[PDB]
UniProtKB/Swiss-Prot annotation, chain A:
Family matches, as SUPFAM superfamilies: ATP synthase (F1-ATPase), gamma subunit
Family the UniProt entry places it in: Belongs to the ATPase gamma chain family.
Organism: Pseudomonas paraeruginosa (strain DSM 24068 / PA7) (Pseudomonas aeruginosa (strain PA7))
Cell compartments where the protein resides: Cell inner membrane
InterPro entries in UniProt: ATP_synth_F1_ATPase_gsu, ATP_synth_F1_gsu, ATP_synth_F1_gsu_CS
Main location: membrane
Ranges annotated as spanning the membrane: none
Subunit note: F-type ATPases have 2 components, CF(1) - the catalytic core - and CF(0) - the membrane proton channel. CF(1) has five subunits: alpha(3), beta(3), gamma(1), delta(1), epsilon(1). CF(0) has three main subunits: a, b and c.
GO molecular function, one term: ATP binding
The protein's name in its UniProt record: ATP synthase gamma chain
GO biological-process terms attached to the record: proton motive force-driven plasma membrane ATP synthesis
Organism domain of life: Bacteria
UniProtKB/Swiss-Prot annotation, chain B:
Compartments reported by the entry: Cell inner membrane
Site (Required for activity): S117
Name of the protein described by the UniProt record: ATP synthase subunit alpha
Position of the signal peptide: none
Full-length numbering of the shown residues: 258 to 429 of 514
Entry coiled-coil feature ranges: none
The protein's role, per its UniProt record: Produces ATP from ADP in the presence of a proton gradient across the membrane. The alpha chain is a regulatory subunit.
Highest taxon in the source lineage: Bacteria
Oligomeric and partner information: F-type ATPases have 2 components, CF(1) - the catalytic core - and CF(0) - the membrane proton channel. CF(1) has five subunits: alpha(3), beta(3), gamma(1), delta(1), epsilon(1). CF(0) has three main subunits: a(1), b(2) and c(9-12). The alpha and beta chains form an alternating ring which encloses part of the gamma chain. CF(1) is attached to CF(0) by a central stalk formed by the gamma and epsilon chains, while a peripheral stalk is formed by the delta and b chains.
Family: Belongs to the ATPase alpha/beta chains family.
UniProtKB/Swiss-Prot annotation, chains D, F:
Described purpose of this protein according to its UniProt entry: Produces ATP from ADP in the presence of a proton gradient across the membrane. The catalytic sites are hosted primarily by the beta subunits.
Lineage: Bacteria, Pseudomonadati, Pseudomonadota, Gammaproteobacteria, Pseudomonadales
Family in the record: Belongs to the ATPase alpha/beta chains family.
Assembly, per entry: F-type ATPases have 2 components, CF(1) - the catalytic core - and CF(0) - the membrane proton channel. CF(1) has five subunits: alpha(3), beta(3), gamma(1), delta(1), epsilon(1). CF(0) has three main subunits: a(1), b(2) and c(9-12). The alpha and beta chains form an alternating ring which encloses part of the gamma chain. CF(1) is attached to CF(0) by a central stalk formed by the gamma and epsilon chains, while a peripheral stalk is formed by the delta and b chains.
Residues of the full protein shown: 343 to 457 of 458
Descriptive protein name: ATP synthase subunit beta
Localization, UniProt: Cell inner membrane
Curated annotation (Swiss-Prot), chain E:
Annotated protein name in UniProt: ATP synthase epsilon chain
Organism: Pseudomonas paraeruginosa (strain DSM 24068 / PA7)
Signal peptide location: none
Function: Produces ATP from ADP in the presence of a proton gradient across the membrane.
Assembly and binders: F-type ATPases have 2 components, CF(1) - the catalytic core - and CF(0) - the membrane proton channel. CF(1) has five subunits: alpha(3), beta(3), gamma(1), delta(1), epsilon(1). CF(0) has three main subunits: a, b and c.
Domain of life: Bacteria
Family membership: Belongs to the ATPase epsilon chain family.
Localization: Cell inner membrane
Length: 269, 172, 116, 115, 59, 115
């Protein structure tokens, strides 16, 4: 109610709209950095999968506990366009399913918003990590992954999965659950014993799948942040347009009132 | 060349005389002929042909054109260019050089806002060298205007967008 | 109107219709009349109607008019633009962006409109 | 609206409703640009109760029956205080937001939520 | 190794029984500090519906 | 306020203070909607210096002891120049924001940080 107060609100919202427009292109740039990091880690995982296939097929004399019958990935920061909420919504469906079966559930948490969610509903988290950079390093995941591997060796867990978002396209992030632990004419010159090699390779394989899930979730996060800052830029434009119409009304009314007072004062003098 | 350091103070003096003479007031209490006050003054600043000078001087001066260039100054209130006297003079003049308080406080001393400032005469009033080198300067300042926000986050920019920005910051 | 009466179709170009409105405001203030909303003359709609109603198509010929329009304070709801838009049949918008691409004429096919 | 005129129970219920609606009005611009998901765990719960209070204040009238078709409702002061006190205490946090719209007394919001 | 291909699957850090166990103990320690006690779990569905409705209005 | 009337050292300090405060005026509205963490490493540092400069402009006057309670401070031109150049160059980035509020010359700000 006052042209000048309205003019100050318009300038304030305009200053905010300029940075949310810039933050969209910054999110797209970081999305491309995450997509190149997703591709760079694939050769190692596919090759480890190709070895374990023979060292088990070719060697039917030994079965690892992981070859006979949740880790949750989340962001550490704001501006996520429903990314974490769509993932928790999808997770609760499977946790509810495990209670219809009457089974107990163990949980591992990656990221601050995931820790905040389970802490607000009393979730029984067994292992956690948070405050990771936008470009994470595999050596930080070893801890959280081992606690979950040990619970399998101790017979406390029948199946283990990684809960994270998958990059369908630059405009679509899909929440998913992937099973981790339960997975031709010549033979290798095994220098150490074959058990030691298979036991070590299965661990490297599971850690690599968790690292790939974490890096793909970060690509999904930058894509979700792009949409959120695009929406914030568009929402601010509607508020600016409405305030400009209110400002023009106050501009016209002030001129009409001043003229009425000048004509009224000059009729008396 | 003539400089009128404050046409807004001339309008205030003419408004005083008009109200004391009891003439009917309009918007902001100015008289009905305040537009004619500044227009009658500013239309004298002109360039006259050789025939005009030859006729005026009775043939004493031949083959030469005379001129009077004007640089009127007006003071706005909190950047409001829609006020009555500023609106009249902006419509009478051939162009406007807008100075801004935000640019002046940000260390940009000759506070000329190139984005809104205009000269309707344009390159016709420029030497060959300046006209040739001025076109590139305008493109840079426009680019920098469309890329200023990305200055506090230059790390994440394409080389070419990063390039446009660095040329803009130096030209400014 | 003389050319129209010869049986012709005529073009009337008005350099600026806002200056016609302002000249009416100035004359109304000089004559001492009581000002209206936003300080315009009380006769604003009648002065516009007296000019615009002569520009029509008749049984003898027609006068078509192209009028340049100035919008005060960028406010399309201001009495001058609002009174003028009631008489216009088409709106041609010239774009600085289209002229930069080398296209001429610089009409904006999305912002320009017609009642026809 | 004074403790010495209407008693402390009515006065505190009315003051509680005004505090929740005032805090919801302060968040309107933030919610319009960034949405509800960015608010704190405390503000999210308050906004959910503010939306229910705002809807429970509605009431179908016996003179408005011609406009919509719905039958009119008369609600006593006792039923009015009990409904808003329960929503402020959190006794209805599980019922859906549309169950409070156009229902007279608080018990009818419980029956409307069954659909 | 294969007669027509040589693959080296390297590790970014030096694995070892102390380093391998330390990271697990720090991850366990983090989860102890994070969780204090149980809470209402039936609220998940209502909270998810509240946020699913609120998240739609924003776009 | 001209280098030909006073000197370049004084003028550069004055324009330096003005530059920092002018840039902070646009960031104040940014921090209030999107938070401090979204600013650049240079912007976060500049905002902290601007808030400190804004406080070092304060000074308790002898005629204001009845309003402030604390004693009055007279500061000299050279002392004023040296204090503002120190905050601009980063010599006090480690001191807390509240240490510059109501403290005459720059020395007392270093002492207030210890209380």
């Amino acid at each position: 109610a006052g042209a000048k107060e309205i003019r100050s609100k318009i300038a304030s919202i305009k200053s905010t709209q300029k940075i949310t427009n810039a933050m969209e292109k910054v999110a797209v740039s970081k999305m491309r950095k995450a997509q190149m990091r997703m591709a760079a880690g694939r050769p190692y995982a596919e090759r480890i999968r190709q070895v374990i296939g023979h060292l088990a097929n070719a060697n039917p004399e030994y079965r690892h506990p992981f070859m006979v019958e949740y880790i949750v990935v989340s962001s550490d920061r704001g501006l996520c366009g429903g990314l974490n909420i769509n993932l928790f919504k999808s997770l609760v469906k499977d946790m509810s399913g495990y209670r219809e079966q009457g089974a107990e559930i163990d949980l591992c948490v990656i990221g601050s918003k995931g820790a905040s969610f389970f802490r607000s509903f009393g979730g029984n988290v067994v292992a956690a990590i948070s405050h990771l950079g936008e470009e994470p390093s595999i050596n930080d995941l070893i801890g959280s992954v081992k606690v979950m591997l040990d619970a399998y060796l101790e017979g406390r867990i029948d199946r283990l999965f990684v809960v994270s978002n998958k990059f369908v396209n630059t405009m679509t992030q899909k929440p998913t659950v992937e099973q981790l632990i339960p997975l031709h004419h010549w033979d290798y010159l095994y220098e150490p014993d074959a058990k030691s090699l298979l036991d070590g390779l299965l661990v490297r394989y599971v850690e690599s799948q968790v690292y790939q899930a974490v890096v793909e979730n970060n690509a999904c996060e930058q894509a979700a942040r792009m949409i959120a800052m695009k929406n914030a830029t568009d929402n601010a434009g509607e508020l600016i347009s409405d305030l400009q119409l209110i400002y023009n009304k106050a501009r016209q009314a002030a001129i009409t009132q001043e003229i009425s007072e000048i004509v009224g004062g000059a009729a008396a003098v | 060349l003539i400089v009128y350091d404050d046409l807004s103070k001339q309008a205030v003096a003419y408004r005083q005389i008009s109200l004391l003479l009891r003439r009917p007031p309009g918007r902001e209490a100015y008289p009905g002929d305040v537009f004619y006050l500044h227009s009658r003054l500013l239309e004298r600043a002109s360039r006259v042909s050789e025939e005009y000078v030859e006729k005026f001087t009775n043939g004493a001066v031949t083959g030469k054109t005379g001129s009077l260039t004007a640089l009127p100054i007006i003071e706005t209130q909190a950047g409001d260019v829609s006020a009555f006297v500023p609106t009249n003079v902006i419509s009478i003049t051939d162009g406007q050089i807008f100075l801004e308080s935000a640019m002046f406080n940000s260390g940009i001393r000759p506070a000329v806002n190139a984005g809104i400032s205009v000269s309707r005469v344009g390159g016709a009033a420029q030497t060959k060298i300046i006209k040739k080198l001025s076109g590139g300067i305008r493109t840079a300042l426009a680019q920098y205007r469309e890329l200023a926000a990305f200055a506090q986050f230059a790390s994440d920019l394409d080389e070419a967008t990063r390039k446009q920005l660095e040329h803009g910051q130096r030209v400014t | 109107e003389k050319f129209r009466d010869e049986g012709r179709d005529v073009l009337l170009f008005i350099d600026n219709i806002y200056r016609y409105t302002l000249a009416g405001t100035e004359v109304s203030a000089l004559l001492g009349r009581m000002p209206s909303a936003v300080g315009y003359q009380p006769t604003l709609a009648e002065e516009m109607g007296v000019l615009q109603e002569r520009i029509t198509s008749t049984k003898k010929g027609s006068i078509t008019s192209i009028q340049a329009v100035y919008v005060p304070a960028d406010d399309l709801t201001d009495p001058s633009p609002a009174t003028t838009f009631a008489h216009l049949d088409a709106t041609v918008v010239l774009s600085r962006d289209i002229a930069s691409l080398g296209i001429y004429p610089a009409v904006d096919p999305l912002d320009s409109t017609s009642r026809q | 609206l004074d403790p010495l005129v209407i008693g402390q129970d009515h006065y505190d219920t009315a003051r509680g409703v005004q505090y929740v609606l005032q805090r919801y009005k302060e968040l309107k611009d933030i919610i319009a640009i960034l949405g509800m998901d960015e608010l704190s765990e405390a503000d999210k719960l308050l906004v959910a109760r503010a939306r229910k209070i705002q809807r429970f204040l509605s009431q179908p009238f016996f003179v408005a029956e011609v406009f919509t078709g719905s039958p009119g409702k008369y609600v006593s002061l006792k039923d009015t205080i009990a409904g808003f006190k329960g929503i402020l205490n959190g006794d209805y946090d599980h019922l859906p937001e549309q169950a409070f719209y156009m229902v007279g007394g608080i018990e009818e919001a419980v029956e409307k939520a069954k659909k | 190794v294969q007669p027509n291909m040589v693959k080296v699957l390297a590790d970014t850090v030096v694995r070892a029984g102390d380093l391998d166990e330390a990271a697990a103990q720090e991850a366990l320690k983090a989860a102890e500090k994070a969780l204090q006690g149980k809470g209402a779990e039936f609220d998940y569905s209502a909270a998810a519906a509240r946020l699913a409705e609120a998240a739609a209005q924003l776009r």
